[PDB]
Design a protein around this ligand. Structure first.
Ligand SMILES: *[C@@H]1O[C@H](CO)[C@@H](O)[C@H](O)[C@H]1NC(C)=O
Ligand SMILES: *[C@@H]1O[C@H](CO)[C@@H](O)[C@H](O)[C@H]1NC(C)=O
Ligand SMILES: *[C@@H]1O[C@H](CO)[C@@H](O)[C@H](O)[C@H]1NC(C)=O
Length: 607
């Protein structure tokens, strides 16, 4: 189509499938295996990226150009990697992925949205779509084109350390919240074939439905473990939202560390190829989890040759290595050279990877847009996060007896009030895991508003606000306080570090609530990624709110405490009476909840 040096795959006017086929037909085995290889930025250099024809890079949790890096520092880092990839013989751009799972959360100054369990409490799919839209903009502000979200796990046991990453124990709620996908990617057109990948253009990102499949169903909630359930239960609980993700054009799917009835998902040809590809007609790319193929074996990494053969034959397309790319590339090249892995399997993996890259516009816009930098932490997105935080709150108690005056909403004008607890003025605790660091962190780790700061912003100027982190009973009784707001709960965690068989909050938390509430009427705000043992907190408190992990916008909590809005959140999970009941789900013979799925008290906005 015209100029003497015309190359069809470089022609932006050609159909995607024609561009894929034209490029694939020109590639060497080294160029094909390179596309299937994703590496950490920590091991990337210009020569590594060119010499190994690398297809993708990622930042793991906390993998950043430096602490406090600006949006432009991120764009310059990503573009430097891209310039190296674009300089190869074929000039195939790399795709850069990151865990943007509640905002662009590794990045300083990014808006931090509530974690998924609180979003499930909102029952508001359109809110979650808007959160996807804002998240795409803040990810593109940093030059990154690919977000590893949504987690569509259906967490069936809150002892799991990733329960907060699940919208709900009820698959129907998880299905509803797949609206995150067209938020991040853009809406698919009217014509659209389920299972095809879609991203609208340079202001959107590729999404990732994860982790396929049954990651929320593991024995005792043990992370990365075995999910024991018949096919009927797998298909009835854990699978449905993957079909909604196909219908919405999700570009990629990430495989689970978990096993299904003893078969590693990373080695499961029947599910990855037979079901996801051949039954659901998924045409995007399938990516491993981090060292996911290493973990097929016990011990992990003890037969990496088998890990590569089993995973690639199972149908995985792109491997998140993420460090030992030389070994990965060498073993896979040997398997192909030996006839153990057919060329047809390599060509399928590369076809899918290229299909996603051409579809999303990456060959047309491989570099960052400096004009997008200011999207990072934009006030409109903070207002959205504040809306979501407020909608996520579930009021569990509002008065000790049926005849007491309800404590909430609290008055903004009072002579003197107390704000207390470990979680009242700790931005890292209110954001939880996957915030700045992989495991999250403590204190003022990014830009945001703590519960204490939100209270000071909300109250009448005549209201004196006193903060004490862990006051004793006498300090409270002598203080002349009108009421107290006391915030306690879990410390930040992610995945295995969060697996927890007792689900009791760290001390001092309960002791502080008891000291405070013993001296003055108190509203307890519980920060957690899941239900935790709650009867002692309830017995002490006049009012108690499950605020989950509400993110950077602490004013969402005070918006409801002071009656600017009514409480509307409803439990997206069962609240247990004791951990010895677990697992305990609706329909079980022993279903005996402290609070059932859907429970939530309400208030009306103050007049
Ligand atoms: C589950 O965890 C146990 C206990 O640590 C371990 O022995 C086992 O290998 C795990 N099983 C799977 C399938 O991951
Ligand atoms: C509850 O489990 C957590 C994490 O496994 C642990 O750190 C904490 O000390 C436990 N409390 C107990 C065993 O009483
Ligand atoms: C809250 O609104 C509902 C419905 O209008 C009403 O039934 C209730 O009495 C209202 N006010 C209070 C303070 O409960």
């Amino acid at each position: 189509h015209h100029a003497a040096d015309y190359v069809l795959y470089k022609d932006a006017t050609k159909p995607v499938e024609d561009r894929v086929a034209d490029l694939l037909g020109r590639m060497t085995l080294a160029e094909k295996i390179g596309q299937m290889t994703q590496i950490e930025r920590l091991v990337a250099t210009p020569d590594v990226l060119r010499d190994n024809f690398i297809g993708s890079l990622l930042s793991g949790g906390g993998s950043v150009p430096r602490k406090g890096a600006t949006a432009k520092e991120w764009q310059d880092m990503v573009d430097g990697f891209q310039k190296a990839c674009m300089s190869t013989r074929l000039g195939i751009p790399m795709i850069y992925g990151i865990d943007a799972v509640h905002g662009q959360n590794n990045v300083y100054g990014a808006t931090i949205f509530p974690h998924n369990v609180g979003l499930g409490a909102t029952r508001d799919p359109y809110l979650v779509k808007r959160i996807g839209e804002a998240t795409a903009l803040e990810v593109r502000a940093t030059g990154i084109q690919y977000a590893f979200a949504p987690c569509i796990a259906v967490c069936r046991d809150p002892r799991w350390g990733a329960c907060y990453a699940s919208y709900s124990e009820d698959r129907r709620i998880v299905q509803s919240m797949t609206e995150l996908i067209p938020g991040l990617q853009g809406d698919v057109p009217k014509d659209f074939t389920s299972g095809m990948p879609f991203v609208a253009g340079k202001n959107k990102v590729a999404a990732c439905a994860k982790h396929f499949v049954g990651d929320g169903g593991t024995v005792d909630g043990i992370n990365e473990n075995n999910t024991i359930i018949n096919r009927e239960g797998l298909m009835n609980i854990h699978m449905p939202a993957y079909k909604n993700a196909m219908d919405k054009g999700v570009s990629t799917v990430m495989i689970s560390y978990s096993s299904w009835n003893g078969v590693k998902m990373h080695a499961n040809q029947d599910l990855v190829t037979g079901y996801l590809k051949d039954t659901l007609k998924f045409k995007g790319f399938v990516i491993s989890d981090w060292e996911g193929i290493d973990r097929i074996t016990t011990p992990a990494g003890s037969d990496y040759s088998y890990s590569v053969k089993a995973s690639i034959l199972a149908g995985l397309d792109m491997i998140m290595v993420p460090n030992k790319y030389q070994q990965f590339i060498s073993i896979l090249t040997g398997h192909v050279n030996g006839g153990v892995i057919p060329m047809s399997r390599i060509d399928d993996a590369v076809t899918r990877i290229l299909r996603v890259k051409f579809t999303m516009g990456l060959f047309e816009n491989p570099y960052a847009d400096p004009a997008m930098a200011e999207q990072l932490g934009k006030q409109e997105h903070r207002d959205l996060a504040r809306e979501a935080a407020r909608k996520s709150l579930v009021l569990l108690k509002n008065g000790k007896t049926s005849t007491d005056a309800p404590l909430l909403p609290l008055p903004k004008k009072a002579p003197k009030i107390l704000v207390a607890g470990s979680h009242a003025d700790n931005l890292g605790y209110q954001c939880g895991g996957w915030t700045i660091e992989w495991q999250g962190d403590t204190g003022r780790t990014t830009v945001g508003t703590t519960i204490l700061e939100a209270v000071k912003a909300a109250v009448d100027p005549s209201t004196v606000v006193v903060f004490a982190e862990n006051p004793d009973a006498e300090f409270v009784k002598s203080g002349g306080f009108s009421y107290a707001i006391v915030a306690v709960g879990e410390h930040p965690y992610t995945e295995t570090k969060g697996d927890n068989l007792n689900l009791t909050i760290p001390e001092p938390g309960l002791s502080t609530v008891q000291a405070v509430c013993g001296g003055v009427r108190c509203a307890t705000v519980l920060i957690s990624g899941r239900p935790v043992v709650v009867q002692p907190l309830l017995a002490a408190s006049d009012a108690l709110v499950a605020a989950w992990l509400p993110g950077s916008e602490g004013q969402g909590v005070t918006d409801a405490l002071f009656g600017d809005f009514g409480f509307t959140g409803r439990l997206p999970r069962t609240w247990f009476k004791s951990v010895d009941q677990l697992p305990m789900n609706v329909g079980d013979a022993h279903y005996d909840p402290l609070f059932r799925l859907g429970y939530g008290l309400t208030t009306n906005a103050t007049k």
